[PDB]
């Protein structure tokens, strides 16, 4: 018999590894982190300085949010849980609106990012939306390998696709992410689960670790050249720089800006200490049923500047060392796989820290 | 050398697996949530809208439990820590009893199953129960694989076959299953030691993980048409998603339903809050010796129908994310193994929760 | 290179499992957990009704405890951190002594061991102890592979061989079991570290896991027919099941009996709740340099009997689970390896235990 | 399918063990504890009486404590966040100045040690510290395999080579310590984020664990006669003895000699207990950007000579357990893998410490 059980060898496919599981193993190195190049394809055609995106949430990324994103060298997606035209007049506000890396299009302006659902309304709100100059549509579905998700995505790239560049939902197998390639999406987004906020894995039993998921994705994805973004479930800028080198482009940035200021949402004083509002889109405050997140309180940090100073050097000290010169080396990185003992190894043990360091806290 | 220790590669058969070791793998899909059918066969003449059955514990189910859950789309059944007549008189308390879903017989009285033991005072209530109008027998056994619960299953099959159908006791082997099967049991039930109040793999230092078991029991169980019910150790909608994706057509509900209106015991008032007495049939309160059971409290729930809607809507969330139109379809998912940290990153984290989900409660 | 590092295969040899990594799994049985017979060998010509022996601890076996564990059809053996004189005068106190499972020598006298050390001042001690009437010597060390050990041994089974049994010092690799067996002892003691005061596998790094250790102790000892004991990390009566059913014939009980009224020390009273003393005899306090343990306190349990009634339910249920009429036979159940999550289900979870367990505690 | 994911069998290289993950097997021993000699080389040609080193650190190494590791038997060796005429000065204290294991040079005079970086005004200190009287200069990086840190060896090889040792930066890989090799090392220092204070795999994510590091690195410099250091991540003299089994020949040591009386530092007081500073160098305030350690505080301890005899001590311990005679014999003892139950069974469990041993803290 099968040693897990039964007499079918493919019931469990595959063991799945997550962040905490792998650490980069050095290798040979002529980079200097200050020389690192952290600039990568977020779609086909759109190149960031800082491959970081904002997150498609209701208490992370507004009109704030998705300037101050562009203008730090990343972009920001603004939300769907607004009306149609009050989601038109963000977009107008980023497009209106020191900051040498900052995104521009052709015509100097900030970039900015939509995220749609699937159906006729949604149909109209993308159309009102790419009307109003958005750059990037975003198919943000909880499982992108609907039939109606993969339509949907087919009835876009027909329609605007000279125009914009559509990002699929989210997926976590090979096949998903093939079946988004052929279906003619600029980008594939990655992630079923992984979230901070997320409960899906628990309400419904379903998803796959991220390391996995994203390399089964680039599996999928890199013969057709198509970006990976990793979406979810990511905390440290280690986790950033483990999620480039297994492949993907692009990073997506959930509770780790939804406690700076640029974040939409009132600052909740709590014993003398600071802390905001964050919350997943399928939790029940967010979706007015059967939840598949939560609401709760993140720490408040500041300006986002500093966030995404301290995260892009914790990336340039990955780069530095692997030795990888741009993002295209570093995701030819090799991983080794620890056990729980490596990971309480790599945090700091042993001690009582007594300052808190500006890219570390317990 | 065998790497584990010995000379006898057999020793140690196999590396069993349990619910929080496994993840339910997303495919490709055409179904919705609301248009998933969940019914599934409770024995191989039996049919319930919703594949969930009440324990037969002394906490959990009684009359006024039985109804609600024959209701509900379920079943319930009778534990028999009860004289004989007290039994009968709920069996028939229950068949004397806005719901779309319940479950009827064919003269339009509710459904309702019925605990024995193995004996002759055994035989005497199971005549008693069967003459009293119960539909379905449970040979309720901490060890199905024991000779007298095999002479005991034949003889009720011999008996009563005709008029109701016979459940097997506990099992967590293939051998086990196939030895029920071959005895003439209607459905098989399976587990021993992972409910949420035994100690038998603490007192006796037997069992076997859940997962494991549902595979190697469905591996034996599958060819003659015998259902598999699926018993104890669920705590989410997603474990009970995984363990009919196992193979298992229904599972059995402890905990999850001790702490509803519907169950039997006075509400317990502590700090304020409100909790309900669970405790396990092998403990020493309830056999009232070497116990294989605790006695403990569950905070209160309410209705049994929201929590059975809950529990439903989670189902039919995975029934989606797998593409699974029927039971039978899901029962032919795939699997990923995560491992601790993977388990974490399924569980929200990083985040100080607010207010509580329906669904969710840490 | 191997997938640990290095290019050596045998660099690290075997993946060690000790008690809580394995589960019995259920068979055929036709065994009533009240016709098990529970005798065991603890030499190759002395058997235990009870297979169980208190450890040769100061304050776990002194006369009173020896007596009691005599009385309940198992043995002790008196620690020899005495005097040679006041051992000698314990062991006339134990043989100078309602109780149907005694475990008496042809006299009609309680069986009784006593523990000696290596040098000829041991060798004084020892011949003193045959003169006072002891039963079986065990050379008590810390690693019985030394030279001195094994020539030791061979002078005591060459000098009071007939007279008397010995017993060899802890091992815990095959190569040693097998020197110990060549060396003429008539039973093998295994465990080096597991003990819950012991700090030996953390101030010098050295050990193996019980159960791969009994394996391999038994891979070379049962050829031979001399017995093996396991001794120390056993917390639980399924832990005896799973050392008895890997193939060792007796198990040395530590804390479990420290917290007895039998046990030598007086009782600690700390908040309403009573304790008493458990040290290591490699305990800087015991050994009065590098300790190789720690003084700490257990709570209070009562009478012996209870304690001992309560480790042989267990067992008696492990053996009708298994379908095991005999010891000998239960040692050749097979097992399963579980994960730290299949361990989590394995106790009592998701509950708050209200009553208290005759066997069982938080 | 790769079983993690992708086509690539080389994208997770290898699975890394740490300290916590293997235990030292027995073996047959002729060795008395007292007898064992822990003689081992430190360079090609210095040979340490203990083989153990102080860390270059600004909170743990100056003049006293390298003095009084030189006396206790080891070495110490200054860091280089002092202005270069103050680590020459300190290094002329040193050589300015019961201890029948003390190292000494030719001619009489204490050993001593300094670190130095990489580059033209790191050459000026280099020279200055030569001039001055140094015995070793270790260049100290974190990233070894870096082309400046290999051409900075080479040059010091070249220079002084005569007159000094080189012992090249912390690598992580076998590639990295045959390149250190090949530029001409006298010594090669492993380990890249093990550290008690380090954030290198939180903040870059990048490291491996210390077992296979060491595996993989005597792998590479055992056949060309390369001494190995094993720097950070030792809680116990469990750990230098399982570091010195994995082929290092000696350890350096953290916040195991941080919190002496003779470590740099003020002594503090907090609700009745005293501490001391204890901070990473690549800290926030020890650079004074991206800091890759935390500042915070340990437990006092008090004088050297008593915390080196205990290390001592216990590596004595595990020689005698391993039948090794010299630190050569036990550069080949075996390992044994074990799990998580295996670690907390490693160490003391079901038990209330109430004294705290001298070798031992909970
Ligand atoms: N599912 C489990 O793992 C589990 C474990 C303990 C108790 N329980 C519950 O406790 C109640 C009583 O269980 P019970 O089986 O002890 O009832 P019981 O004492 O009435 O036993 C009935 C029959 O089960 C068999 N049996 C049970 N345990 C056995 C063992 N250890 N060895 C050999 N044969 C054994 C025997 O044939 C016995 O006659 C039931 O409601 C049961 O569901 C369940
Ligand atoms: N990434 C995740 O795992 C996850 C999980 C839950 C919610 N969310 C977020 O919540 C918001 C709403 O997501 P949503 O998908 O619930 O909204 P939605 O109702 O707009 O769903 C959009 C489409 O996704 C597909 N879909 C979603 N859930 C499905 C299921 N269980 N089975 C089959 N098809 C399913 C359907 O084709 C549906 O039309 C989004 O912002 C999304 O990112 C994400
Ligand atoms: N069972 C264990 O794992 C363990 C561990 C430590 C101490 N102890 C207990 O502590 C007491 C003293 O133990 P002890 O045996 O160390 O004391 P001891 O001084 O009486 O040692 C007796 C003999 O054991 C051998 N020995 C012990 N440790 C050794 C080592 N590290 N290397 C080589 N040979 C070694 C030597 O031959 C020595 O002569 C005893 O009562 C013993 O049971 C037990
Ligand atoms: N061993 C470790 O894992 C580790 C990690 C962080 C800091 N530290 C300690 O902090 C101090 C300063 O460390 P440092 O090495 O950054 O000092 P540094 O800034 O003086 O660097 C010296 C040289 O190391 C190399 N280097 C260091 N980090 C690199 C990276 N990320 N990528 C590429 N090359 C890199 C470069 O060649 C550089 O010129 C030292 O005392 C060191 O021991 C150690
Ligand atoms: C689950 N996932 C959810 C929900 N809303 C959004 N998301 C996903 O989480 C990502 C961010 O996660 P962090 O780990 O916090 O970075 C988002 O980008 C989105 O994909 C929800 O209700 N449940
Ligand atoms: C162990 N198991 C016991 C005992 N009484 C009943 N049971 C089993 O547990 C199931 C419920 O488990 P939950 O996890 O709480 O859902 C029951 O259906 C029954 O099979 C006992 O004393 N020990
Ligand atoms: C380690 N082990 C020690 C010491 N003294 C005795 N022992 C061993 O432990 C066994 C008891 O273990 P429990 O887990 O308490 O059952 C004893 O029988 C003996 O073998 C010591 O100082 N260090
Ligand atoms: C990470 N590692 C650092 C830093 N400064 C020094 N080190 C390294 O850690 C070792 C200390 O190990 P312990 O576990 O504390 O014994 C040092 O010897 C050095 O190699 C730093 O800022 N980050
Ligand atoms: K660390
Ligand atoms: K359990
Ligand atoms: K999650
Ligand atoms: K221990």
Not at 254 to 260: F, R
């Given at each position: 018999?099968?040693?897990?059980?039964?007499?079918?060898?493919?019931?469990?496919?595959?063991?799945?590894?997550?962040?905490?599981?792998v650490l980069l193993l050095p290798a040979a190195s002529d980079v200097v982190?200050?020389?690192?190049?952290?600039?990568?394809?977020?779609?086909?055609?759109?190149?960031?300085?800082?491959?970081?995106?904002?997150?498609?949430?209701?208490?992370?990324?507004?009109?704030?949010?998705?300037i101050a994103m562009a203008?730090?060298?990343?972009?920001?997606?603004?939300?769907?849980?607004?009306?149609?035209?009050?989601?038109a007049g963000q977009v107008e506000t980023v497009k209106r609106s020191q900051f040498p890396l900052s995104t521009k299009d052709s015509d100097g302006r900030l970039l900015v990012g939509a995220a749609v659902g699937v159906g006729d309304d949604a149909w109209t709100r993308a159309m009102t939306l790419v009307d109003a100059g958005v750059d990037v549509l975003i198919v943000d579905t909880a499982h992108?390998?609907?039939?109606?998700?993969?339509?949907?995505?087919?009835?876009?790239?027909?329609?605007?696709?000279?125009?914009?560049?559509?990002?699929?939902?989210?997926?976590?197998?090979?096949?998903?992410?093939?079946?988004?390639?052929?279906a003619g999406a600029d980008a594939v987004k990655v992630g079923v689960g992984p979230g901070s906020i997320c409960t899906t894995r628990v309400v419904a039993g379903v998803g796959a670790p991220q390391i996995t998921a994203i390399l089964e994705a680039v599996a999928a994805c890199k013969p057709y050249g198509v970006?990976?973004?990793?979406?979810?479930?990511?905390?440290?800028?280690?986790?950033?720089?483990?999620?480039?080198?297994?492949?993907?482009?692009?990073?997506?940035?959930?509770?780790?800006?939804?406690?700076?200021?640029?974040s939409p949402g009132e600052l909740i004083f709590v014993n003398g200490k600071q802390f905001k509002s964050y919350r997943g889109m399928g939790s029940l405050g967010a979706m007015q049923l059967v939840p598949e997140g939560i609401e709760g309180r993140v720490p408040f940090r500041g300006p986002l500047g500093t966030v995404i100073h301290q995260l892009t050097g914790g990336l340039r000290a990955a780069m530095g060392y692997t030795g990888s010169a741009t993002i295209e080396q570093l995701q030819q990185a090799q991983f080794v796989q620890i056990t729980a003992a490596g990971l309480k190894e790599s945090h700091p043990h042993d001690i009582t820290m007594t300052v808190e360091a500006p890219n570390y806290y317990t």
């Amino acid at each position: 018999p099968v040693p897990t059980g039964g007499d079918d060898p493919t019931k469990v496919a595959m063991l799945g590894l997550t962040f905490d599981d792998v650490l980069l193993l050095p290798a040979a190195s002529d980079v200097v982190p200050a020389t690192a190049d952290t600039s990568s394809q977020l779609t086909k055609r759109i190149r960031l300085r800082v491959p970081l995106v904002s997150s498609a949430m209701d208490t992370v990324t507004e009109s704030r949010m998705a300037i101050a994103m562009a203008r730090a060298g990343g972009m920001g997606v603004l939300h769907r849980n607004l009306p149609v035209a009050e989601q038109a007049g963000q977009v107008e506000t980023v497009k209106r609106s020191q900051f040498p890396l900052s995104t521009k299009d052709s015509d100097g302006r900030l970039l900015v990012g939509a995220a749609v659902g699937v159906g006729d309304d949604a149909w109209t709100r993308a159309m009102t939306l790419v009307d109003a100059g958005v750059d990037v549509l975003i198919v943000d579905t909880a499982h992108a390998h609907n039939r109606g998700v993969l339509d949907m995505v087919s009835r876009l790239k027909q329609a605007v696709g000279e125009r914009v560049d559509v990002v699929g939902g989210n997926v976590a197998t090979r096949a998903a992410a093939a079946a988004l390639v052929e279906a003619g999406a600029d980008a594939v987004k990655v992630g079923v689960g992984p979230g901070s906020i997320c409960t899906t894995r628990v309400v419904a039993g379903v998803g796959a670790p991220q390391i996995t998921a994203i390399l089964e994705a680039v599996a999928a994805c890199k013969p057709y050249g198509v970006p990976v973004i990793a979406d979810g479930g990511l905390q440290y800028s280690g986790d950033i720089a483990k999620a480039l080198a297994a492949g993907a482009s692009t990073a997506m940035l959930g509770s780790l800006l939804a406690g700076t200021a640029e974040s939409p949402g009132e600052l909740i004083f709590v014993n003398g200490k600071q802390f905001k509002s964050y919350r997943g889109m399928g939790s029940l405050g967010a979706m007015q049923l059967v939840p598949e997140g939560i609401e709760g309180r993140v720490p408040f940090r500041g300006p986002l500047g500093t966030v995404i100073h301290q995260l892009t050097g914790g990336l340039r000290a990955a780069m530095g060392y692997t030795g990888s010169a741009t993002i295209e080396q570093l995701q030819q990185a090799q991983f080794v796989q620890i056990t729980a003992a490596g990971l309480k190894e790599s945090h700091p043990h042993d001690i009582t820290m007594t300052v808190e360091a500006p890219n570390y806290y317990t």
